[model samples]
Target: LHKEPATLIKAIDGDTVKLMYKGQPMTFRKLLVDTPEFNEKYGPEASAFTKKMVENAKKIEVEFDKGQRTDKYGRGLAYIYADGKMVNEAKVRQGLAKVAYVYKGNNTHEQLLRKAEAQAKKEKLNIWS
Candidate 1:
C-alpha cells in the first residue's frame, strides 16, 4: 500500500484504462488480463461489461514489480486489487478478459486468472468459445 489511491477514469480499450493518479491523468496496462477487441465479434459487449464492473469501485490497491512498470505510452503495468481481490481476476471470471502469459514481474495471482479464463472460454461467455 505504498502507492496513493486512484480511480478508474475510463477504459480506453479492452487492454488499456485511464486513471487519476494523484490528480494526474494516466493510463495503466492491466496486468494479466486480455479482453476482447472492439471489432473482434465479442468487442462492444466486453467493453461495456468492463465499464459496468469498474463503475463504482474507486479505492484500489496496486501491486508493483520490477522492470519498466509502464510502456513509453505512460500506461502502468499493475495488478489492481480492490476489496482485497484482484480486479483482473474478476474480469476473467466474468468472461471479459483472458489469461495472458506473464513475461516478467509478478505471478502470484496468475493461476487464478488462468483458471477463471479457462472456465469462461469453456462456457463460451465472451470470445474463447
Candidate 2:
C-alpha cells in the first residue's frame, strides 16, 4: 500500500525495469502484467515503448503487491510509474502486455488495469488482436 521513489536505471523489457532504489540497484518486475520476451514477437516494440517512457520522465516510482515483495530471481514484484503515470496499466491499455500473475491480497490497480485491458481488446491492439 506504499509507493516508493526509484530511479530508472534501465528498462529490461516492457514488464521489467531496472531501477535504483534506496541507493541500491534492483530489478523490478511489473505486477499484474506480462509483456513479450526479448526473443518473442512484439518484444522490441513493448520494451522500446517502456524505455522511451522512463527515459523521458523525470521521476519514477514503484508499488509492491501485498502478496510477495520479491521473486525467486530477487526481482521486486511491483508496479512501475513514470512521471505519475502507471506503466503497468499503460502497457495493458496499449496492448503491449496482458493481465497476468495475480497474487493474493488486495491488488491495488487491478480494476484500472483490467478495464484498460478490456478497452485495448475492444480496440484490437497488439496482443489482444
User: Evaluated with TM-score, which candidate comes out highest?
Assistant: 2
| RMSD of each candidate relative to the true structure | 2.5, 1.4
List model 1 lDDT by residue over 36-110, tens digit each.
788877789877766655665656656655555776676788777655666788888878778885766555667
Pairs that collide in candidate 1 are: none
lDDT values, one for every candidate: 0.72, 0.85
Misplaced by over 4 Å in model 2 are none
Q: What C-alpha lDDT, on a 0 to 100 scale, does residue 18 get in candidate 1?
A: 81
lDDT of model 2 at position 9: 87
**lDDT of prediction 1:** 0.72
Model 1 stretches with alpha carbons more than 4 Å out? 1-4, 82-85
Please, what are the lDDT tens digits per residue for candidate 2 over residues 72-98? 889988888889898888888999888
